[PDB]
């Protein structure tokens, strides 16, 4: 009889999805001023008597600041050399080390290179998961969760995935410059003449309106992945969620009466991640933060 666990006065919110199955919805919010990262993760548990395995739907959202900066290169001679640092690739990952836990799905599953991204994950009673690459369809599942994020001029693709981990990467792709398209590897990307030898470092590079949101502001992630647990066995398990970025450098040295020289330092600062360690309590269906960096 007494099988829904909690403490006195808990805020336990559950969605009854029909039959002897329900969904226990939990959320956690972690911020970090050091890394400029906010993790707004939803933890939707799947209680189902017709399912012989515990299930946890993790929807990872939030915001990862672009960490873009325009600076002068201090020192004599570098009075006409300016430096731009911008994010080349955003990192979202979920890794675990519990042997009794394994990942059963993840969205996006395949590399997608459109400006907008909208995908759905559905659940039918009995342990049936299937994912549709749209937010189209009306009420085929007992419970559905969607992902939604825009990645202008970037490309979302899976980098690592197996039974204990999954890692995405939103790499830079193609940009629209006033003189045609420019690839993400064009060393002369984002550089321009600063109109004289007194302009600011900011004037040595493209305006803010020629920069996509992922370069100016940042990236709002929206990734889903589900993990299964064998009933019994382990009562608690841990996993880590990484929100990060990779930074490139684009120096723009100005030469008078001649031209503006440019060169790119690719992957100068990698793994600029904010990793948070969570712990699941499969008995009480609750999440808690163990720590972060």
């Amino acid at each position: 009889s007494a099988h829904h666990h909690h403490h006195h006065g808990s805020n336990t919110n559950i969605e009854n999805i029909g039959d002897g199955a329900e969904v226990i919805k939990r959320t956690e919010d972690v911020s970090s001023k050091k890394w400029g990262v906010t993790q707004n993760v939803q933890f939707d548990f799947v209680k189902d008597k017709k399912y012989n395995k515990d299930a946890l739907i993790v929807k990872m959202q939030g915001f990862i600041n672009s960490r873009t900066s325009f600076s002068d290169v201090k020192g004599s001679g570098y009075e006409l050399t300016k430096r731009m640092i911008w994010p080349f690739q955003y990192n979202i990952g979920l890794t675990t080390k519990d042997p009794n836990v394994s990942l059963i799905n993840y969205l996006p599953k395949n590399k997608i290179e459109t400006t907008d991204v909208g995908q759905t994950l559905g659940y039918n009673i009995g342990g049936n998961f299937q994912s549709a690459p749209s937010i189209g369809g009306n009420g085929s599942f007992n419970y559905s969760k969607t992902i939604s994020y825009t990645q202008k001029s970037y490309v979302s693709e899976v980098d690592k995935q197996n039974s204990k981990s999954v890692k995405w990467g939103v790499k830079a792709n193609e940009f629209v410059t006033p003189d045609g398209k420019k690839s993400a590897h064009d060393r002369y990307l984002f550089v321009q003449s600063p109109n004289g030898p007194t302009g600011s470092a900011r004037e040595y590079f493209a305006p803010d309106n020629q920069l996509p949101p992922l370069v100016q502001s940042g990236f709002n992630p929206s990734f889903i992945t589900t993990l299964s647990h064998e009933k019994g066995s382990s009562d608690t398990s841990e996993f880590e969620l990484s929100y990060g970025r990779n930074l490139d450098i684009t120096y723009a040295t100005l030469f008078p009466r001649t031209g503006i020289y440019a060169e790119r330092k690719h992957n100068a600062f990698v793994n600029r991640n904010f990793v948070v360690r969570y712990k699941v309590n499969w008995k009480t269906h609750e999440i808690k933060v163990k720590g972060h960096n």
Partner: antibody, heavy 120, light 113 residues
Framework: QVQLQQSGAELMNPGASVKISCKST????????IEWVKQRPGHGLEWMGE????????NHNEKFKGKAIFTADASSNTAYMELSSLTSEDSAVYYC?????????????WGQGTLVTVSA | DVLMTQTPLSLPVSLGDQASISCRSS???????????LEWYLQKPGQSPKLLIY???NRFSGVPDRVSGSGSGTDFTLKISRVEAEDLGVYYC?????????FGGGTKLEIKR
């Protein structure tokens, strides 16, 4: 306008049933458990059970597993409890209690109580 | 479904003395989150139960300073500094960390006029 305002007095013949209310204001149930407590006149306080309304998922004590049924209506703002096979044992006062934990401070509300008399 | 054994059953106390109520659980009340969810309730006659102290020690809004609760593990104690004629009634210890929830045997506090 009292947070948990219960039903009035009641008289039901033995063997029958009765369903009492617990009209609940307070911001949002369907997320916060509401429990029921029984008090014999012999100074005995006994915890019956609770229910999460928005889910209907109940959680009761084995003593009242065959004697108490918990329901709740999200359309209005009420939760109910029904008692089967009324005997002289079940003649008591029944309170409903809600409690909210939050992070700063802590709330605990109770109802005035509903008297249930089992006679003919 | 743990047992809650209160002691004493009847505790007389004069106007100004100190009254202490012990309550011991048949299992450690510590929940997996780390907090011990023990509570003390006061039911004056003809009224609904009123909460005094939540989570062993933390006092409730509107509780006088004479009240203080302590304890650890399974044995707990509620103490009243300067007992007054308005504090009489029945005191119950309640556990809220393990379902099903259970109350205490009740402790009747009478005055000595």
């Amino acid at each position: 306008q009292v947070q948990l305002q219960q039903s009035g007095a009641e008289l039901m013949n033995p063997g029958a049933s009765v369903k009492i209310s617990c009209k609940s204001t307070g911001y949002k149930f369907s997320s916060y458990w509401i429990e029921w407590v029984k008090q014999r006149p012999g100074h005995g306080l006994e915890w019956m059970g609770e229910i999460l309304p928005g889910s209907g998922s109940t959680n009761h004590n084995e003593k009242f597993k065959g004697k108490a049924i918990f329901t709740a209506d999200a359309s209005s703002n009420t939760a109910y409890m029904e008692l089967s096979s009324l005997t002289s044992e079940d003649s008591a006062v029944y309170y409903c209690a809600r409690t909210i934990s939050t992070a700063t401070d802590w709330f605990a509300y109770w109802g005035q109580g509903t008297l249930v008399t089992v006679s003919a | 479904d743990v047992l809650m054994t209160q002691t004493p059953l009847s505790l007389p106390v004069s106007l100004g003395d100190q009254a202490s109520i012990s309550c011991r659980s048949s299992q450690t009340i510590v929940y997996s989150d780390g907090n011990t969810y023990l509570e003390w309730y006061l039911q004056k006659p003809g009224q609904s139960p009123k909460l005094l102290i939540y989570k062993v020690s933390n006092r409730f809004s509107g509780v006088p300073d004479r009240v203080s609760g302590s304890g650890s593990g399974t044995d707990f104690t509620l103490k009243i500094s300067r007992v007054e004629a308005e504090d009489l009634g029945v005191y119950y210890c309640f556990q809220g960390s393990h379902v099903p929830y259970t109350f205490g045997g009740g402790t009747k506090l009478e005055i000595k006029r």
